[PDB]
Amino acid sequence: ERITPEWTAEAVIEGCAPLTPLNMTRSIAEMHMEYPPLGITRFFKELGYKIAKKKRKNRFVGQLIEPLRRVLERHHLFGATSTTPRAVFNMFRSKVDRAPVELHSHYPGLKKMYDILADLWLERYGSMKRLTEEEMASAINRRGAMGYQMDNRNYGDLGAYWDSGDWRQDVNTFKRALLSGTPTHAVYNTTAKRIIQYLPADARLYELKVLGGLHKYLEKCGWSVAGQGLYKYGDRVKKSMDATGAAISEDVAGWDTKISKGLLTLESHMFTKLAEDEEMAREIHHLYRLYADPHMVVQREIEGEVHDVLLRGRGQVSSGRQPTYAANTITNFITTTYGMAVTLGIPEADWPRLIRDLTDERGNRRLLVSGDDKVLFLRGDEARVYASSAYRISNDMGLVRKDMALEQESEIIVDVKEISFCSHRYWPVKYGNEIHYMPVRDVGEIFAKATMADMTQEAWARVQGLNMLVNYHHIPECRMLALAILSVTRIGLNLKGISTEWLRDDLAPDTIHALITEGRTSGWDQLGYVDFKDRKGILLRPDTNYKNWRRDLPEKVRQLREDGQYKDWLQKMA
Ligand SMILES: [Mg+2]
């Protein structure tokens, strides 16, 4: 039914530069809208639409696991078509087309904590430079799409665009138009996988250049796992639990869709504080003027006609933006620390020390944060105070917790192995005579992510094999699949084009022991396994289906090998 959304008033946040909309006329015209809007969204404002056109498994990994596909689909979460435009628009309306809560009483306290963190980072680490070309080359996804506004340049993917060097002039053109107040290439494209939003490739490279340094501060933070591999997370979870004794690990449903323009105004305020010069601050501020006023093209289908629909929102966070992870991590830390401080009655004059202590992993409160994922660690007495009322503050901000009633008290976790962080739990695994906590999740999810993405298909599989060996060797079916992947993929591929210490053809256990025990242990035989008794549930039961797959893996490896040079890794196991 034909709806005309009325947005609430905007928050006015003292001490912060407002994120005024840009002049979008040029960027809107670049999308070549044809018809006036239908208006069937409740929050997003439709500007117009045009007639469009309806928008596999890696062969190496996929064939290696094929004998297991049945048990993985039945007993695990492997789960294996393109989403129709009808379904795309239905999931946009269900999940994205929801107004953020702009108006609440928490901005002054949130600002205080953003300011404290910014002053701490500046005091200890200095201000933030734009990324260098070399840093940008390390961070790009070479397989990223170009965007409708860039499709008629025929680059294929980001990697080809990057190699051509043409982006150098385009990024400067993007910058100048943006700073004029009338950007080019500022309308988001979307694809369905959830719905991924992304600016054109030139805009994405500019974002990375300006805001990509935020990751460097996060690497210094004891509440962040930025730059650290998954094999380190369990020990961090254990260390945090040992100093506290109780954990609260709650997810927000659709975190990205709930971030307000008010929260974005705070992010911008903080990041301009960090910028290296005044022009950079203006660039960051102008990027956030774009972010807080997102325009995007989403598909739909009515009466058999496929539409490309131009929609305008307010606030929210787009997923296909490289700085998003770092900005999400910071805002998740601040909103969580704020709600905890207010709920526990920590006086505001102690908030600078509180944020320093969280950052230094000192005291008996700890956080671990990655994107929208967080675990809060507290002593039992404070955990009970937190669990019974901190949700009121996040509810006030629209940060509603997933899969629980609105005012349900938080579950207090007291067993380190029940803490979920970054979609894993962590179990103690023996390396020689020491213990390290290593990640586990449903093996169907592990295998699916290793399977669903030329010589880059082979290089991609090989990197999945190296990653699986490093992170999941303690799960027997994962170590086995990893060794099979490394036996069927050829030596000499460019893995770095596709995670530096171990991205090598000559990877050996000494590299893995260096990452986990700093080389106190050695050899294949000191790489631990989970106990046989626990090989069930999320892990593959070691029955005849597993054993037959293992039996036929050497033959399958020989059949999948082609003209390359290979080594036999399956003999490293049994
Ligand atoms: Mg969590």
Author numbering: 303 to 357, 363 to 387, 391 to 503, 519 to 778, 785 to 829, 836 to 911
Copy text verbatim from the article accompanying this structure deposition.
Jingmenviruses are a category of emerging segmented viruses that have garnered global attention in recent years, and are close relatives of the flaviviruses in the Flaviviridae family. One of their genome segments encodes NSP1 homologous to flavivirus NS5. NSP1 comprises both the methyltransferase (MTase) and RNA-dependent RNA polymerase (RdRP) modules playing essential roles in viral genome replication and capping. The NSP1 RdRP exhibits a characteristic architectural feature commonly found in viral RdRPs, known as encircled right-hand architecture.
To gain insights into the structural characteristics of jingmenvirus NSP1, we conducted a crystallization screening experiment for three variants: FL (residues 1–915) JMTV NSP1, as well as two N-terminal truncation constructs, namely D55 (residues 56–915) and D307 (residues 308–915). Although the FL construct did not yield any crystals, the D55 and D307 constructs produced crystals with flake-like and stick-like shapes, respectively. The initial determination of the structure of D55 involved the utilization of the SAD method, wherein Se-Met-substituted D55 crystals were employed. Subsequently, the structures of native D55 and D307 were resolved through molecular replacement, utilizing the Se-Met-derived D55 structure as the search model. The D55 crystal was found to be an N-terminal degraded D55 protein, but the precise N-terminus of the protein in the crystal was not determined. However, electron density was not detected for residues 56–302 in both the native and Set-Met-derived D55 structures. All three structures are isomorphous with the same P212121 space group cell dimensions. Each crystallographic asymmetric unit consists of a single NSP1 monomer. Due to the significant similarity between the native structures of D55 and D307, with a root-mean-square deviation (RMSD) value of merely 0.2 Å for all superimposable α-carbon atoms (with D307 structure as the reference, covering 99.5% of residues), we primarily utilize the 1.84-Å D307 structure for subsequent illustrations.
